[PDB]
Amino acid sequence: LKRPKTFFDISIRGDKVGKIVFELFNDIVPKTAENFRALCTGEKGIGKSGMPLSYKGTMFHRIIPQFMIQGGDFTRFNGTGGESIYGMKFDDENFKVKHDKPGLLSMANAGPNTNGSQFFITTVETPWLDGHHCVFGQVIEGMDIVKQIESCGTESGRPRAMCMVTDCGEMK
Amino acid sequence: GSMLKRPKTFFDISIRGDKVGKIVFELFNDIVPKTAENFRALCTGEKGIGKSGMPLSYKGTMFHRIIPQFMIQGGDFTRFNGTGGESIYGMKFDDENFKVKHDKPGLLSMANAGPNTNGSQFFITTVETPWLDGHHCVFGQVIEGMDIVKQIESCGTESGRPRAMCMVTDCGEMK
Amino acid sequence: EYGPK
Amino acid sequence: YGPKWN
C-alpha cells in the first residue's frame, strides 16, 4: 500500500504562508498513522469532548526554536486537550523510527501509552525522545513553513505569533 | 473651530481558518478621544514595537473569551489568552469617562481588571449590558459586520472558553 | 477572568 | 504536555 499523504494549510499572524505536506508511515505504525490521517480529514465526526475530531483551525500552541513545533489541540487550543480517534488516549504502538533528523512527525504525550491528538514536528535531531514518543511520519513539503512557525517560538514554548492550520485534509 | 469626523477602523475575521468578512467600527473621538486613539492606533499598528517587545497591533490576535448573549472579547497581542496586552500609553491607562452607556448591542468597550487598568483588550457587546456602566469605558460602535460579530459569538460558551478560533487576520484604519 | 463580568 | 527537552 501507498503511504498516505496529508496537508496543513498554514497562516502566521493572519497571513497565508503556504502548505505543509506529510507522508505517514502506515507501513510501520498503521494505528498511529491512521489517527493522524483521519484527524486531517475530520471524517470521524464529533468526539467524546463534544467537538469535531479535526485539525482544522488548530494552532501550534507550543513552539520551541531548535527543538520542535507542537500542535493538534482541537478541544482546548492550548495544549491541555485533544482526543484521538480511539478515545481520549491510545497506546504507544512502537518506537521503530528514531528522532534522528528534522521534519519528523511524532506523537506528543504525557508518558507511556497516553497518545491523543497532539503531535510535534521536529526541527532538529532529538534522540533523547527515542523510546518515549512514536514517530509516525515526516514532512515531504513545506519544511520552510515549519521553520517559519519555529521562528515564532520561544525557549518556554510560548508563541509570539498565532500560527494556524487554516485547512487540512488528505491528498488522494 | 474643529470638526474632525469619527475615525473608522476594521477587522478582517476568520473563524476556524475560514475568511468570513470584515467588521467596521466608528470610534468616539468626540467623547473619549484618548481611549478612541489607543484603539485606532492599535488597528493601524503605527506605534511600532511595545514594551512587551511585540508589535502594538491587533493583527493576528484572537477573540479569546466569547460569551453568548453577552459579549466577545479580544485584543491580547502579547499573550493571546487574556493575560496580556498593552496600550499606546504604557502597560495601563486610566478610565477616561463613562459618558456612553452600554445600552445596545454592538458597542465597543474597554476590558479591564478594575478601575484605571485599561490596556489593549476590548469587547463588543451582543446585548444591552447596563450593569457595566461606570466600570467599562465605551468608545466606539460597530457600523458594519454585526453578523460577523454574531458568528464569533456563536463559537462561545458560558465560561467564555472558545469552541473555535476566531482571528483578526488583518486590521487597519479606513482613511 | 479578565474583562467584563 | 508533549516532548521534553533533555
Author numbering:
A (entry chain A): 2 to 173
B (entry chain C): -1 to 173
C (entry chain D): 1 to 5
D (entry chain B): 2 to 7
What's written in the study?
To obtain a greater clarity on the interaction between TvCyP1 and Myb1104–111, we co-crystallized them. The asymmetric unit contained two TvCyP1 molecules forming an anti-parallel side-to-side dimer with non-crystallographic symmetry. In the initial refinement cycle, continuous electron densities (at 1σ cutoff) located in the active site of TvCyP1 were observed and identified as parts of the Myb1104–111 peptide: 105YGPKWN110 in one protein molecule and 104EYGPK108 in the other. The 106GP107 atoms were inserted deeply into the hydrophobic active site pocket of TvCyP1, whereas Y105 nestled in the S2 pocket. Presence of Y105 preceding G106 in Myb1104–111 enabled optimal interaction with the S2 pocket in TvCyP1. In protomer I, 105YGPKWN110 was in an open conformation, while in protomer II, 104EYGPK108 adopted a closed conformation due to an intramolecular salt bridge interaction between E104 and K108.
TvCyP1 is a cyclophilin present in the parasite Trichomonas vaginalis (T. vaginalis) showing high sequence identity to HcypA. However, for Myb1, the nuclear translocation is regulated by TvCyP1. The interaction of TvCyP1 with Myb1 leads to the cytoplasmic release of Myb1 from membrane-bound vesicles, an important step preceding translocation to nucleus.
